[model samples]
Target: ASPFRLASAGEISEVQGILRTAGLLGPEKRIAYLGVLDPARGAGSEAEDRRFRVFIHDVSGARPQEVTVSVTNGTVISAVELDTAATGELPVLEEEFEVVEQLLATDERWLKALAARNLDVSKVRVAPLSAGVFEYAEERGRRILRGLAFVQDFPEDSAWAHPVDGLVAYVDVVSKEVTRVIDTGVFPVPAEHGNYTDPELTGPLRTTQKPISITQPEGPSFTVTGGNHIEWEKWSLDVGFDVREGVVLHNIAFRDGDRLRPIINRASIAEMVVPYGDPSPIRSWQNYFDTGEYLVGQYANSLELGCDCLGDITYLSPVISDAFGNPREIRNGICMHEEDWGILAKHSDLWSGINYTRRNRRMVISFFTTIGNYDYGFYWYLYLDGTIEFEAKATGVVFTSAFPEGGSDNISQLAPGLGAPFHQHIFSARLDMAIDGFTNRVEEEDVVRQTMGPGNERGNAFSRKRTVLTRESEAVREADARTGRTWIISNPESKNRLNEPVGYKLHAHNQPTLLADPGSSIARRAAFATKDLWVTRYADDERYPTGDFVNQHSGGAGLPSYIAQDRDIDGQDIVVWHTFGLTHFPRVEDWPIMPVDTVGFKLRPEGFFDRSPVLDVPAN
Candidate 1:
C-alpha cells in the first residue's frame, strides 16, 4: 500500500489501542481528529514509515494534546500538549455539541430567556456556535460555545425559519456552565414554517418539465485501483478525505503517450469563513470558520443514489473517527461519475461542405457536508482537454433573524417579518503545483492595450504582458477582470515544442475579498481572505490557510504567518492559495430553501501540451 493512502478503519482501531495501552488516552478524554500522517518531504516510502496523527482533548485539562503513532511498530512515536495561548484551541468535537446542548437545558438564565419569550423549552433548538475571539473576560482561556436559539414546531421542521432573536447564551463546555447570557430584546418569532419538503407548503410540482434519463448501458469508463486511486481516459489521481477538509485530491497527472506528467501534487479547500454584514449587537460577532471550527467532513451527508448523483456512479465510503475514537464510515461520502459536457470542438468547413464535431465529457469527484443552517458541496472536475476545475456549491436554508427595529440595510426581507443577513462565503483553496516536476515558477499575464503607434497606424492594437513573480512578497496578487488577469505556473526546467515553458494557466473571477475593516476581529482571524491569491514556499506543516487550530483563535496565524519569511519561490517547490467565493445579498425567493450558488476557478493547459490533447477523441 502507498504511504499516502488514507488510514483504514482497522488502522484507526489499532492506533487507538496503542494509545490506550500506552496510557496516553484515558477513558474521560476525547479524540478531536485522527488521520493518516502526511509523509515528510523527501522521505522514503517504506513499510515502517506508515503513521497516524491523533489529537486528544482531556475534559479536565487546560490544553489539547497531539500524538503520532506508528502502525508498523505498534507504538507511540511522539506526544505533546499544544500551547493554548499560542496555537489557540483545537477544533470543536462532535461530543462538545451534545454537551453544550444538554448544558443549556438546565441553565436557569437560558431557560428564563425562553420563558420570557413564551417559548416551549422542548421545541427550542440551541445551535452551538464557535465562540470567536473577543474581549469577553469570562470566555478567555476557556473552552466555550455561543448558543443561538431557534424555534421548531416539531423535530422535522426547519429551525432556521423561526429564529428566536436577541438572546445569546455563552457556555463553557469545560466547566459545564453557562458563563453569561446577553439579551438585547425579546422579538416575536417568524411564523413561516419554511418547510419546502412538505407537499402542502410547496403546493404542487411543476408539470412543464419532463424527465430525461441518462445511462451508460455498457458501463462506466473509469477504473479504481487500491480503492482510492482512479484513472479515467488521460486523467489519473488519488482521492483523500480528511476530518476537516472533505475531498482532497493528490498527485494529479495526465497521460501523454507513455509518460504520466504531473500537474498538481495536492489540492483542497483548506479553509472557509462566513462573515455577516449586520452590525447589530445581536449579530456583531457572526463570523464563522466553517471548515476549521466545525469540521465539515465529520458531518458529511450519506448521499442517496438518484438524489445526489445520476447514471453510473462509484461511491467511496470514507472512514473517520468519532469523539470516542471509534471508526465510523460515511457511506457514499464521495461520488465519482462521468458527465456529458456538450461539445469539445466543432467546425464546419464551408468550402469543403463537411461538418466535424466531438462530444465533451468530464469526470467529477464530489462530496457534500451540512453545517448547522447551511449545506456546502465541493466538486472537482477533469476534462478531456487537460483542464481542471474546482467548484463550490452553497445551498440549504438561509440563516434568518427577526426584523430589526426601524429597519436595517444589511439585511434582506425574506418573509413578512423574517430577514436574512448579507454575508460572504470566502473559500481558500490550496493548490500545490508540480506542473512538470517540482521546479516550477509563477508568472502574471495581462492584456495591455497600446496607443496608436508606428506599428499600429490604424489603432486597435493590444498585446499580452507577462511578469514573473520571483519571491513570496511579489506573488501576493488580486484578480483583475479589466486586464484579463491570469497566473501561469510553469516549469522552467521543461519546455514544449516551441521552446515555451511547460505550464498551466489559472483563471479566476474577480470576486470580492473580505469586506470587514482591517482592524476588525474577523479581518484578523480570516486574514487569508483579504487577498485573492497567495504563494508560499511548500512546507509539510503548512497545510491549512487558517492555521491548524482555528476554534476561537486570535488572528496573525496561517497564511499571514507563513509568508512573513518572504522565502524565494522562483523555480522552487511552491504552493498557491486562491480565495474565491460569493458575497450574497439574499433575495426574497431564497426564503425557505436556497438555490445553489456556485463559484470556482479553472486551470487550463497553457504550453504544457505540444498540440491539442483532444484531437484523438473518437467522434460519435
Candidate 2:
C-alpha cells in the first residue's frame, strides 16, 4: 500500500519544475512541507499510488493552498490545487545563517559593547536567542522583525561555555542594525578554562570502569513493519514524524489475548513554551513557542547505536524537506527499544501460600530535538499493562543572563558574574482518544470535603464530585491540588467485568500555569497555557494548540478560536490536550549543562480492562 513517505528531493524538484512549467511556482510562493497524501481509509498500495500533497503558500497572492500532484513510474501525472483557504503570509522561518548575517551586519554596535568590557569582538561566540514576540511597549502594534544577541566567550583554545558577563544586543531584522544594547557590565572570565578533551579541569572520576556492558541476549521483543508500524506484545501503533511535533504515533491499539481494541487514534506534542522570568525588556518578552516558531524537528539529532539507546534498538528514518524545498532522509531519527520498566506488581509470602510477581516490560519509542540552548528528548512508552507514558527530558546549557558585578554579591548568581535567570518549560501533548471506539465522554472527578451532610456526619469526611463536561466551553480545566481533581475519558457503551465504563484517566505531574499576566504580551501570545487540560471535538486540522501559523502571529488562532465554537464534546470523538512544565529558578549545577528535567503525564487504564492485564505474565 502507498504509505505516508516523505517526498524525495528529486520528487520535490520535479513537482516544483512542473509547477514552474505550469506557471504556478513563482517568487512569492513558499513551500512548507510535502509528502505522500494517502487515502482517508486503509493504507493505499504503491501499485495504485499516484497522489501527493504539497503545502505551498502564495505569499503575494495572500493565500495558502495545498497543491496535489500525481506520479506513476517516476513520471508526472496530474497537478491540481485544493485547500486554498488561508489568506496571508505564514511568516519566514528563522535559520542560523540568517541570524549570523544579522549579527555581522550590526557588528559595529556589538563591538562597541564588547570593547567596553575589554573583550575583543573576534573572541566572542554569538548565537541567536530566539526573539519571539517583542513586548507591547516595544512593538507598539507593528509586526517588526528582530533577533537577540547571546554573546559567549571563546577563550584561547578552550571550551565555549565560559563567562563574558551579560552582554546582549537587539538587532533589527530588516536593516540589520542594533536597536538596543544591554550589558550587565561584568566580564568574569575564569583564569583557566577547561577543555573537555584535555580532561584536566573535570570530574575526579576517570577510568573507573570500561563502558559497562549491558546487552539483551535475546534482543528486543518488538517488530517493526512498513518502516513506521511497531508492534510489541499487546500494543501496536504506527510511528510518524513531523518537523514541528517531531515524533507522532497513530492508530494505537492493544490486544489482551482476546481482540485488538482501539486506544489512542493519534498523539503528538501540541505546543511548548520556555519563558524567561527576567522582567527587563531585553528578556521579559522571551516566551518561546518552540514548536510553532523554531520547528525543532528540523534540528533533531540522530540517535547513535549503543550511545543514545542501549540493548536491542530499532532505528527508523523519515524524509524531511529543507528550506530550499529539497527532501533529505534523516537516518536514525527515532530509536525504539524494549526496556525493563522495573516491576509492575509483586506480592510474596513466607507461609504456606503462593508468591505473585510481575516484572514490567515496555517498548520505548523516542527522539530528540534541540532549540537554541535546550535539548529536549521525548520518549513514548507502551507498557504490558496497557498504559502509555509520555515523557520529556530537558538537558542543555542554561540561557545565562549577565549580572552587574564581576566578583561577589552578584544577584541571581550562578557564578561570579552570571545570573542563571528563572524560566519554565511548558509542554502539552495532543492525545486523540479512540477509547473502545470514538463515542467517548470526559468528566472532572474531584474529591471535596463534605460539610456535615448525608454520609459525612463525622465532620472529617470527603466525597466525590463528578462534573460531566459536555461541551468545549466546559472542558477547559486546571489542576486543583486543593481538591484532588482529575479528568476521565470513558465510553459508556463499553463496560468491563466490574460493570464499570471502560476508559483512561489523566493526571498532570506538575504545577504552575502561565504566570504571565493575562493582559501581558506573553500571556496573550500563548493563551493555551492558561489551563492544564483541554478537550475538544475532533477536527482534521487543529493539530497545534497555539494555532497553525505561529510565526509573527497577532494572537486569535489555535485553541482560543477552536474552543470559541463551543462544539458538543460529549459521547463524540474527543481530543484531550494537557500542559505540564517546570518552574525552575535556575541554580549553580545548571551551568555547563542542565540536569535532565523530566516532566509528562501518564494515561492509566481506568476500567478499560477487566482486571490486571499483566497478571498472566510468567515470573522471571
Candidate 3:
C-alpha cells in the first residue's frame, strides 16, 4: 500500500461526520482544509492505520483550530485552537467573498466613498483581497479582507480596467462590519475595457497563421494506476492536489533495469508572493500570499481539451471539500500528456559517413488556477533522460492602477491613463528529496576562475569547486549565474559504477529574489524568497515555506523559524526549498491581457545512473 495516496472522499466524509458528532462542526464552523496526515505518522505506516488532519474555522469567533482524526479507528486524536496573533488567519473561504459584498453594501462610509466619486454603486465590483498585516488596531486579531472596487459596464464585462483607485474598504468577515474606509482623493477610472475575449474590443482576429494539430494516433505513452498514480517510461509518481498547494507530486522515482531508484519523496510549489513595488499608500500594502491566503487550488480551472491542452490527454479530477465540508470535485483538475522535444542526442561520424540522432519526449503533468486578476499554470515535466522540471506560467490581466501624467519609475503606463505597477512573482518549491535513497547530503557547486598565478600563466583557467553544506544555516544560499552555481543532493551511501554518489543537480533560473528591503513587512513575511535555495533536515511539520496560516501573518514564522535550530543536515533525510520566479516591469504590450510569463527550475540527474539510461530508447 502506498502511503502517499490522497485522502479518499469516504475518508473526508468520515472525518467530517466525526467532527460534527464531537460538536466541532457547528452552524458557525467551517472546514478550512482537510487532507491526509503526514505519512511519517502511524497513518499508512501499517495497513490498518489511517488518519486525517483537519482545519476548522469558527466564523463567529474568527478562531482557527487544528484537529487530527483517526479514520481507521473512528476517534479524534487531538484538537487545539491556533493563535491568530502568532500563526496568522485562516485562508479566505469562498463564502467570505459574498459576505464582503453584503457587508460593504450596507456600510454608510463605503457607500459614501463610492458616491463621492459620483459612481453608480450597482456597476461597482468589490474585489475581496487578503488584508496584509500592517498591525492596525482595528484589524488586529480579526478575520479581515480588503475591498478594492472596480467599475463594470455590465456584469459580464471585465472590471479590471476601471479600477477605483485610492478607495479601500476594510471589512471584518467575522463581525460582519466594515472596520474602516480609506479614501485618498478620487482618481478617474481607465475607460478602456480589459476584455480580451470580446471581439468588439479586439477588432479583427489574426488569420495569417495556419493551424497546427497535435495527435497521438496510438494514444498516450503513459499509464495511470489507481487514479492518481502515474507511470511513464522510466518515471513513476503520484499526483496529489491540495486546496492550498494545488498540485503535489509524491514518491517520484525512476526505474533503472530491475531496481527502482527513488529521487524525490514529495514535491510541490509550497507558496508564492506577489509584491507590487509602488510605495503609494493604496498600493504599498498590495503584497499577497497567493497560495496560503487565497487557497490557489480551490479556484482551479476545469481545463479544456484543445483549448488548455493538446494531444491525447488524460485528465484527473481532484476531490476537494468546500467551506461547509461538502466534497466537490474539480472536474478535469489535472491534465497529463506527452510532449515531443526536438532531439536528445546527435552525433555525426564524418569519416564513416554515419550520423546518429535520438528523439526526446517528456511526460507533462499540469494544472491552472485563477487567483483574482491573474491566472497561473503549474507544469511538471518528466523527461526521457531522467530530468525533472517545474514551470509556472503567469498570464491574464495585470493589476492596474490610475496612471499619473508623468509616469513614475515604479509604474508602467499601459494606456493614456492606465498604469500597471512593477511587481515580482516569487515562488517557493518544496522538494523532499531522497536522491537515490534517504540519508543524503547537499553540496554547493560553482565554477571558480583562478587568478593569474604561476600555475595558471594563461590567466584563463577556470575549475569547478564543490562545498559541502553541512548545516541548515550554512545552506541558505543564493544563485550566482556568473559562477554557473548549482546544488547537488546526493546519497553518500549509494554510489555509481565510477564511485560517485548518486545525485541530482538543481538548476535555478537565477531570477531576482524578494526586492523588498530587509526591514519591510513583505521581506519578513515572505523570507523564503530572500534566497534561491534553502536546505533543511526533514520535518513533517515544516511543510509550507511560509507558515501554514499566512493571511496577515506578521513575521518570523516559516523558513526563518525553521532554520533557527540550524541542525546538522549532512547525511540525513533532507528537504530542499528552491525559490525561482520573475520580476515584471510591465510593457505597453502587457495591457488588457499579458502573454504567459514562464519561469521555473530543473532537476537533472547528475550521477544517478551508471550509464546513459535512455540509450535503449527506440528511434522515432
**TM-scores for every candidate against the unseen true structure:** 0.98, 0.86, 0.97
C-alpha lDDT score of every prediction, in listed order: 0.89, 0.71, 0.88
- Encode model 2's per-residue lDDT on 235-319: one tens digit a residue: 8788877777788888799986678899998899978888777775555656677887677777788889887888788888777
Error of 1 at 132 (Å): 0.7
Better by lDDT, candidate 3 or 2: 3
1 or 3, greater by TM-score: 1
Ranking by lDDT: 1, 3, 2
**Candidate 1 weakest lDDT stretch, 10 residues:** 39-48
Off by over 4 Å in 2: 2-107, 135-145, 150-198, 349-352, 406-411, 451-462
Q: Which ranges of candidate 3 are over 4 A from the true structure?
A: 41-44
- Could you give candidate 3's per-residue lDDT for residues 1-620 as a string of tens digits? 55567667877788878888888888889988877765673334566567777889987785679999998888899999898977788888888888887788778988898898898888888888888888597777888888888898897898988989889888888888888888998888889888888989788999899988999888988898877899899888999888889899998999999888899989999999999899888878888789988888899999999999988899988888878777888999899999999899989998999898999999999999998899999999999999899999999899988998766889989987888999999999999998877889999999988999899998988899999999998989989999999999999999999998889899998999999998988888899999999998888899888888898878868988999889999999899999988999999888789999899999998989998988999876
Best by lDDT: 1
Q: How do the candidates rank by TM-score, highest first?
A: 1, 3, 2
User: Model 2: what TM-score?
Assistant: 0.86
- Model 2 — which ten-residue stretch has the worst lDDT? 82-91
Candidate 1 local accuracy as lDDT? 0.89
RMSD of 2: 4.3
Which pairs in model 2 have colliding backbones?
A: 1-44, 1-45, 2-44, 2-45, 166-402
**Taking the tens digit of each residue's C-alpha lDDT, what string does model 1 give over 1-620?**
77657768988888888999988778778998887867776746453477888888989865678999998789899999898767788888777887877888888888888889999998989888888988797676788998888998998999998999898888888889889889988988989788898999988999899877888998999999988999998899999999888889999999999999999999999999999998877778888898899888999999888889877889999999987777999999999999999999999999999999999999999999999889999999999999999999999988888877678799888887898899999999999999998999999999999999799998988899989999898888988899999999999999999999999999997899999999999999999999999999999889899888898889868998999889999999999999998999999888789999899999999989999999899986
